Design a protein around this ligand. Structure first.
Ligand SMILES: Nc1nc2c(ncn2[C@@H]2O[C@H](COP(=O)(O)OP(=O)(O)OP(=O)(O)O)[C@@H](O)[C@H]2O)c(=O)[nH]1
Ligand SMILES: Nc1nc2c(ncn2[C@@H]2O[C@H](COP(=O)(O)OP(=O)(O)OP(=O)(O)O)[C@@H](O)[C@H]2O)c(=O)[nH]1
Ligand SMILES: Nc1nc2c(ncn2[C@@H]2O[C@H](COP(=O)(O)OP(=O)(O)O)[C@@H](O)[C@H]2O)c(=O)[nH]1
Ligand SMILES: [Mg+2]
Ligand SMILES: [Mg+2]
Lengths: 439, 71, 99, 61, 51, 430
């Protein structure tokens, strides 16, 4: 009687969303065609497929997702590949004309011809489930379609459904390496809409993972196919407690209750460990005490933000594997002793500990090698003031002469909209500093 | 390190072995196994003599096969 | 405990509307009454189970192979136990008149 | 095959130090409570007058 | 409340397993079960339909 | 009634006890697993002294095992009778001292006293009427003697009235086995005289001395040397557990072997001990036992008893024997050797009898006598210590762990004073 609806919007969401299903598809013995083999069943417990799947009565199952994108090329690939049989035919709603990175294009002019259909599909899936806990929304900020569509859909959802929880796994632009040239413009606008309409949104900047890949896996030739997979494991970690047995579980509703001190400050960055290739994964014990060390190592943080420049508000750091509770006690204590991790004055203890037993699975053809214990951390720290710091500064340079502005004013949006985003981002800058001042 | 042996040859006696020994009459130190042990050991030593010499020449002949072939 | 007074045993039979003969009443006591010269402490544990064996075969678990009795008009049929079967010596004359 | 078999479903759901206490301390009859040892022993009009004092140092307990 | 544990060589079709004093009658074998037994080398018993 | 506990520390102390509990165990018939199978009723009348009771009837020696290195106590268990010791009593650290007295008395030994002393205070308190403590330790190892002596000092401050026994093994100078021995012995010996009530000296050189030439065993091993000491140590408390003609507990022996407070160093031995090849020529009669118990070679201390004069001596015969032939034979040895015996204390020998002989033997005796010959041992240890100290060689170890050089001088003086004062009587005349 627990479920979650997955929404993928934009190519960044779709490609990563594509990745998140192979991990989910394997984790319950469902082949690409969707039919469970009558032989070689590995299923522990029952209803496990219910958290993300719905039964068709006899045989196969269906995924609980709705893919949105105006560019047919990205969507058309899936319907001709090896997972064609999986998705429901009339939920891959897509258009004809590309957004063209004009944030207004996907939010005032071109988007309005598809948003109506998208919500209606959402109505159908809402009734099928019973007590929906929340939605998972994936999108890449650096694109108008992801930024434009994301804001429109979220605002409609916040009024259509109400108090239900929603999570956004975005991908923000990097400090120095960025593919597009207009990414700073759509970043400021997006956070304006997503600050007032989402519960928990994490940071997944591309540049950091490139460092994440190099140090451990020892691979100098990474591509987005490897990149997305790593996000798949973290996706699995955050939901390990909703479809498996455990000793001390966590519900999705127990995230807006331990990780957001105030309504405004709800940006958190993750970190994963261990990620050790098959060539070296079997020469160390991987103790619970040592693994958590890699969790807080500054370099392995999910995003390119050094935690050492700020405070640590609260870390609801999760476990999966062969962890005994007594060992976890020794791991939490050791972290507090170290002087390089310093917390806030008004949060004596900032850990919400979780445990699940089903060990991580191995996706064939990938890079990850099998392990016993894995800990995924969703940590909120004052260091996040930096990421917004640089983004605001970049916006200032380009709008002084207001270059690139005239490609937007022709999309029907008023001129004053651009300046308004600065109030939201700038005002957010003054709030973090106020949270950290010792009293 | 630990001490799990009284000497290099005899393990500590079976618990049923020490029936007397309450008074200093039974000691297991009088040996009377000394003569027997030496006789068996000396023969075994010769065995490693022969075994190692055979390997050594086998190495030499193969080594000398290296030179003869060079010719 | 597992034992009730012998007289209280008579109480249930009279109240239960099930009628029994005096010599039969002796039969139950000889088989169930606690082995003692005086009276008192008649244990119903053995009696209750066996008599109730015709309802549902209590304690069926722990023996999957066994299957409970179905019981039918043929269950009260054994109530016909009687010395009238002597006619079975030769029922032919009974057959002749009947046909 | 000494400590590699570790599994989360085995470590957590297997009590360690709280299983039945080893034997030689279970030697007690739950049915025998006090007021039953002597008062309910039986009693007898004639007692067995025999007494004995074994010629060995009585064990101290 | 014991200290002896099962080894897969104990389960089999047609025999009684003890599980919390409740008696189980494992009757049918899935398709994938048979091969592993034949691979390891312990005999397998003939099936019968469940009454 | 008047039982005694055991506190054995250090390796050499550990091994010695490793068999001692095996020795007495076979005496009372205690099986290795803790169940009783003894034959005579008397084998259980006075078991309370060394053994304690537990539910289920199994018997546990009330000993304390202590060391700073895992090897000593992780091994003694694997041998016969290794399971009798209670698991709780074991107390062991994680580092080891490495023969450095400093490591054993200030840094590691002292830090570990809190746990060890706690067990002793719990075990001793359980007694009805305690008699005292007996300590076995070796003086050649820093970690052993280091915290070994510190335990003695702490005990005396809270149990002033219970006797205190200690059997120290000091290194003879002929067979050398440790290089830092002089520092350990001289400083350690200083603590024992001030605190310990009684200590019987034992020297390895004698053990070999006894082994080759009287037991004629072809190849001795460390086990054999342990055996003789254990048997002798059982004799000192022999009659405390059994009835006899003249019962004599430990306090009784003290009252007849310590003329003055500061001369409390004895030397002991055992007899008879006949060779496997000689037991058919010797005759077992009381006269034979007396002569051998005084023969110089038999004494466990390398110092020949004949180089000085006796001050006190005690003999605890075993088995049934005519008290005539104990007194007369004992009087025999004190009139034909008037030169070796002090004069101002007449009839300077004690006598005792126990009614239960060692299993498999008929007559035996154990000796305890304070002789001026022990003056020799202190001189040899003292001579080496001064030689090594004039150059401060090997002194950097101890001076770097909070210990100053003044303490060494104080240790030398008191030890130096003992040798001279200890001989103020062997020249003294009435
Ligand atoms: N992590 C990850 N990010 C990607 C991937 N592909 C593109 N991105 C991010 O997406 C940003 C640009 O947007 P796109 O992914 O091209 O697509 P979009 O944002 O939805 O906009 P449109 O392409 O017009 O639909 C880049 O800055 C990248 O950071 C990917 O495969 N993995
Ligand atoms: N005639 C005789 N004298 C004995 C006997 N036992 C001991 N003695 C005398 O006791 C003396 C030895 O010391 P004891 O008087 O016995 O000392 P004790 O009897 O133990 O007295 P306490 O030590 O105070 O308990 C010897 O000189 C004997 O004269 C005995 O059995 N017969
Ligand atoms: N009686 C006896 N003494 C021994 C034996 N083995 C070693 N020793 C003595 O123990 C001394 C070494 O003591 P050590 O192990 O260093 O004590 P520690 O400092 O507490 O570790 C040596 O001088 C030996 O004389 C043995 O088997 N029997
Ligand atoms: Mg596009
Ligand atoms: Mg007396």
């Amino acid at each position: 009687m627990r479920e979650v609806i997955s929404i993928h919007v934009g190519q960044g969401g779709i490609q990563v969303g594509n990745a998140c299903w192979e991990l989910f598809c394997l984790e319950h013995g469902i082949q690409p065609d969707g039919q469970m083999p009558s032989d070689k069943t590995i299923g522990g417990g029952d209803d496990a497929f219910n958290t993300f799947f719905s039964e068709t009565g006899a045989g196969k199952h269906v995924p609980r997702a709705v893919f949105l994108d105006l560019e047919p090329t990205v969507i058309d690939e899936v319907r001709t590949g090896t997972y064609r049989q999986l998705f429901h035919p009339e939920q891959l709603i897509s258009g004809k004309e590309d957004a063209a990175n004009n944030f207004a294009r996907g939010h005032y002019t071109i988007g309005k011809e598809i948003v109506d259909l998208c919500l209606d599909r959402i109505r159908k899936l809402a009734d099928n489930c019973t007590g929906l806990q929340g939605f998972l929304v994936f999108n890449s900020v650096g694109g108008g379609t992801g930024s434009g569509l994301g804001s429109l859909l979220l605002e409609r959802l916040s009024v259509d459904y109400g108090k239900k929880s929603k999570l956004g796994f975005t991908i923000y632009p990097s400090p120095q390496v960025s593919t597009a040239v207009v990414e700073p413009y759509n970043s400021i606008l997006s956070t304006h809409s997503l600050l007032e309409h989402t519960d928990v949104a994490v940071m997944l900047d591309n540049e950091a993972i490139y460092d994440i890949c190099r140090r451990n896996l020892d691979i100098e030739r990474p591509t987005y196919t490897n990149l997305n997979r790593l996000i798949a494991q973290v996706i699995s970690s955050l939901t390990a407690s909703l479809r498996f047995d455990g000793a001390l579980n966590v519900d999705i509703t127990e995230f807006q209750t331990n990780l957001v001190p105030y309504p405004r400050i709800h940006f958190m960055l993750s970190s994963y460990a261990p990620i050790i290739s098959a060539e070296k994964a079997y020469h160390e014990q991987l103790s619970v005490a040592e693994i958590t060390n890699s969790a807080f190592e500054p370099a392995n943080m999910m995003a390119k933000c050094d935690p050492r420049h700020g405070k640590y508000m609260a870390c609801s750091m999760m476990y999966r594997g062969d962890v005994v509770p007594k060992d976890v006690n020794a791991s939490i204590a050791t972290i507090k002793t170290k002087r390089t991790i310093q917390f806030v004055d008004w949060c004596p203890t900032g850990f919400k500990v979780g445990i699940n037993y089903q060990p991580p699975t191995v996706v064939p053809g990938g890079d990850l090698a099998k392990v016993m214990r894995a800990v995924c951390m969703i940590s909120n720290s004052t260091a996040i003031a930096e990421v917004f710091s640089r983004l605001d500064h970049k916006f200032d340079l380009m709008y002084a002469k207001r270059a690139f502005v005239h490609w937007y004013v022709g999309e029907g949006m008023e001129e004053g909209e651009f300046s308004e985003a600065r109030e939201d981002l700038a005002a957010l800058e003054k709030d973090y500093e106020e949270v950290g001042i010792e009293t | 390190m630990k001490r799990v042996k009284e000497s290099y040859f005899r393990e500590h006696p079976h618990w049923s072995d020490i029936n007397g020994c309450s008074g200093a009459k039974e000691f297991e130190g009088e040996d009377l196994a000394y003569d027997a042990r030496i006789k068996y050991q000396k023969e075994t030593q010769k065995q490693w003599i022969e075994q190692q010499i055979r390997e050594k020449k086998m190495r030499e002949e193969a080594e000398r096969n290296e030179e003869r072939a060079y010719a | 405990k597992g034992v009730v007074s012998e007289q209280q045993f008579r109480r249930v039979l009279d109240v239960s509307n099930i009628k029994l003969s005096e010599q039969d009443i002796n039969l139950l006591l000889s088989e169930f009454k606690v082995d003692n010269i005086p009276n008192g402490q008649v244990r119903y544990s053995d009696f209750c189970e066996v008599i109730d064996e015709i309802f549902t075969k209590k304690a069926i678990d722990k023996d999957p192979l066994a299957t409970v009795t179905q019981f039918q008009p043929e269950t009260t049929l054994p109530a016909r136990r009687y010395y009238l079967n002597l006619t079975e010596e030769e029922k032919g004359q009974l057959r002749h008149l009947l046909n | 095959s000494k400590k590699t078999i570790l599994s989360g479903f085995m470590k957590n759901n297997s009590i360690v130090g709280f299983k039945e206490c080893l034997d030689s301390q279970l030697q007690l009859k739950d049915s025998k409570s006090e007021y039953n040892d002597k008062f309910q022993s039986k009693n007898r009009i004639h007692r067995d007058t025999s007494i004995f004092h074994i010629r060995n140092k009585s064990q101290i307990i | 409340n014991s200290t002896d544990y099962y080894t897969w060589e104990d389960l089999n079709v047609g025999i009684n397993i003890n599980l919390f004093e409740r008696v189980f009658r494992i009757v049918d074998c899935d398709s994938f079960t048979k091969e592993f037994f034949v691979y390891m080398g312990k005999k397998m018993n003939s099936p019968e339909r469940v009454p | 009634m008047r039982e005694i506990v055991h506190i054995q520390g250090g390796q050499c102390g550990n091994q010695i006890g490793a068999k001692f509990w095996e020795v007495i165990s076979d005496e009372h018939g205690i099986d290795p697993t803790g169940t009783y199978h003894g034959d005579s009723d008397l084998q259980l009348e006075r078991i309370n002294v060394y053994y304690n009771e537990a539910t289920g009837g199994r018997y546990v020696p009330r000993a304390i095992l202590m060391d700073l290195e895992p090897g000593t106590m992780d091994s003694v268990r694997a041998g016969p009778f290794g399971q009798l010791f209670r698991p709780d009593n074991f107390v062991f650290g994680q580092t080891g001292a490495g023969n450095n007295w400093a490591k054993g008395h200030y840094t590691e030994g002292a830090e570990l006293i809190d746990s060890v002393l706690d067990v002793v205070r719990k075990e001793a308190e359980g007694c009805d009427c305690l008699q005292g403590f007996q300590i076995t330790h070796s003086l050649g190892g820093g970690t052993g003697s280091g915290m070994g002596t510190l335990l003695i000092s702490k005990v005396r401050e809270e149990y002033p009235d219970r006797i205190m026994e200690t059997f120290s093994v000091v290194p003879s100078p002929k067979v050398s086995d440790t290089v830092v021995e002089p520092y350990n012995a001289t400083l350690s010996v200083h603590q024992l005289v001030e605190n310990a009530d009684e200590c019987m000296v034992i020297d390895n050189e004698a053990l070999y001395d006894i082994c080759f030439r009287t037991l004629k065993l072809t190849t001795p091993t460390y086990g054999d040397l342990n055996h003789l000491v254990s048997a002798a140590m059982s004799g000192v408390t022999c009659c405390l557990r059994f009835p006899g003609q003249l019962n004599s507990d430990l306090r009784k022996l003290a009252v007849n072997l310590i003329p003055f407070p500061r001369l409390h160093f004895f030397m002991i031995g055992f007899a008879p001990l006949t060779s496997r090849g000689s037991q058919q020529y010797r005759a077992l009669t009381v006269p034979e036992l007396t002569q051998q118990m005084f023969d110089a070679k038999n004494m466990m201390c390398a110092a020949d008893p004949r180089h000085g004069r006796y001050l006190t001596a005690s003999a605890l015969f075993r088995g049934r024997m005519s008290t005539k032939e104990v007194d007369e034979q004992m009087l025999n040895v004190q009139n034909k050797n008037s030169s070796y015996f002090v004069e101002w204390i007449p009839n300077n020998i004690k006598s005792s009898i126990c009614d239960i002989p060692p299993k498999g033997l008929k007559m035996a005796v154990t000796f305890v006598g304070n002789s001026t010959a022990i003056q020799e041992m202190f001189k040899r240890v003292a001579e080496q210590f001064t030689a090594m100290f004039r150059r401060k060689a090997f002194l950097h170890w101890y001076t770097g762990e909070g210990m100053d050089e003044m303490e060494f001088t104080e240790a030398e003086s008191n030890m130096n004073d003992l040798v001279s004062e200890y001989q103020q009587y062997q020249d003294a005349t009435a």
